[PDB]
Amino acid sequence: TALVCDNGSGLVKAGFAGDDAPRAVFPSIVARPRHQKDSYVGDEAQSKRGILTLKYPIEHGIITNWDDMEKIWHHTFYNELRVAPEEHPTLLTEAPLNPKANREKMTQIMFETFNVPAMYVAIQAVLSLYASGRTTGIVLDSGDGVTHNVPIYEGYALPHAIMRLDLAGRDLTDYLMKILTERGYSFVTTAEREIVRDIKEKLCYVALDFENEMATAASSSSLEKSYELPDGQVITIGNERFRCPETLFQPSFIGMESAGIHETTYNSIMKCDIDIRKDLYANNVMSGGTTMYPGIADRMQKEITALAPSTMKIKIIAPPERKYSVWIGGSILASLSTFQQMWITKQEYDEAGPSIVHRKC
Amino acid sequence: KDSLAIKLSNRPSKRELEEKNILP
Numbered sequence A: 001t002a003l004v005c006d007n008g009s010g011l012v013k014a015g016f017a018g019d020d021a022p023r024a025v026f027p028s029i030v031a032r033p034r035h036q037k038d039s040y041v042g043d044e045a046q047s048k049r050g051i052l053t054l055k056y057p058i059e060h061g062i063i064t065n066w067d068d069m070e071k072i073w074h075h076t077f078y079n080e081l082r083v084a085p086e087e088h089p090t091l092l093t094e095a096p097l098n099p100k101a102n103r104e105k106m107t108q109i110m111f112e113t114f115n116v117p118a119m120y121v122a123i124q125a126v127l128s129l130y131a132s133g134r135t136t137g138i139v140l141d142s143g144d145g146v147t148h149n150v151p152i153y154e155g156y157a158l159p160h161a162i163m164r165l166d167l168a169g170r171d172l173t174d175y176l177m178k179i180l181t182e183r184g185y186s187f188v189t190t191a192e193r194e195i196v197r198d199i200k201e202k203l204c205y206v207a208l209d210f211e212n213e214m215a216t217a218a219s220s221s222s223l224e225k226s227y228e229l230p231d232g233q234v235i236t237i238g239n240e241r242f243r244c245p246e247t248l249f250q251p252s253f254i255g256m257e258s259a260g261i262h263e264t265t266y267n268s269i270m271k272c273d274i275d276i277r278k279d280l281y282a283n284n285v286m287s288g289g290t291t292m293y294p295g296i297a298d299r300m301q302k303e304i305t306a307l308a309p310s311t312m313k314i315k316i317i318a319p320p321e322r323k324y325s326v327w328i329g330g331s332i333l334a335s336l337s338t339f340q341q342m343w344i345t346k347q348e349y350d351e352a353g354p355s356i357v358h359r360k361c
Numbered sequence B: 001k002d003s004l005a006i007k008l009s010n011r012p013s014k015r016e017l018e019e020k021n022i023l024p
């Protein structure tokens, strides 16, 4: 039975190939005591977060703390899935443009620390494309730590045309803390950030027309919503509901010069071969938790329509389970009979070394 | 599921892709 593990900057999604949903979802963190176990992993750190210093081993989609990542994987196999890794082929995920040395190290750790019988490393955006049933299209994957626009042709990501945006869900939570603080409610601490993440996920949305929506917010209180904190205390949120994810379209809101996600989509397509551009426009797939904002697909449709040739068929696909589409795509892929020839086997690793990840994945 | 498998089975090679200028 094959395993699928999507290693997020924010959340680990893990489970078995062939299942519709990840069996286990837990925070990508390792925590250590602030004052006199030596460490706590994932949900175990979450449950004791108040007394621990938290560290994220994955930054902007790239593994940067290998010792802590090994703890994450150990916890995934033994605590979460309750499996013996030497008994299961394992599919891992990686960010677009993940350095070769990173993927070699991942491969080495899997074969040599966990003794997996076989493994494979797949690109997150590609798995989401597959989950939607396509092998050609352009994927916008906005997660907790990074946002990528990834044009894909017949299963192949087109590296020259990939766009990376270091603006994603965590930055948006931080921005919401800031503007709620300006509103009159102080959100400044580490625990308060989690509260504001929940507010963001509950109440934020993307305006179809930002200027019009701001006008409405100023003219009446119908866009206002109350939010009850865990202790019963209540706050109100007004135009911050849509100003927060507006940052995706206007990165200058947090002082970045970068183009917004609509422009990065357009720029990405325009870097691709002329004959595949219309196929990308017709197959724009959203993925990741930060694409969950109500209104986002219609706003993307609008902005891209304005940028594209006026007769271009534009289509935005935003699947309901797109928080987990990377994992779901991996589940589908690993369970295809036609995929069984793709795995990197232990025998193949032993004779070739970690560099075999370049040839097989 | 059935839909994805076919396109994956007919997935052209890294070489055959460079030929059409699509893949570097």
Ligand SMILES: Nc1ncnc2c1ncn2[C@@H]1O[C@H](COP(=O)(O)OP(=O)(O)OP(=O)(O)O)[C@@H](O)[C@H]1O
Binding pocket: A007, A008, A009, A010, A011, A012, A060, A061, A062, A142, A143, A144, A145, A146, A147, A168, A169, A170, A197, A200, A201, A202, A204, A287, A288, A289, A290, A291, A292, A293, A323
């Ligand atoms: N309904 C929602 N509305 C807005 N944001 C959401 C919603 N649900 C989840 N998010 C945000 O999505 C983020 C997590 O998504 P995701 O799990 O795709 O990231 P990750 O894969 O762990 O990160 P990455 O891919 O960048 O390394 C969090 O920031 C979370 O707050």
Ligand SMILES: C/C1=C/C(=O)O[C@@H]2C[C@@H](CC[C@H](C)/C=C\CC1)O[C@@](O)([C@@H]1CSC(=O)N1)C2
Binding pocket: A009, A010, A011, A026, A027, A028, A029, A046, A049, A054, A144, A169, A170, A171, A173, A174, A193, A194, A197
């Ligand atoms: C509920 C779930 C949300 C998630 O996305 O969580 C991930 C992981 C999490 C790790 C620390 C937190 C205290 C642990 C559990 C939260 C897990 O940090 C995030 O909340 C960060 C901080 S706030 C920001 O929006 N992303 C994202």
Ligand SMILES: [Mg+2]
Binding pocket: A007, A008, A009, A124, A143, A144, A288, A326
């Ligand atoms: Mg992700």
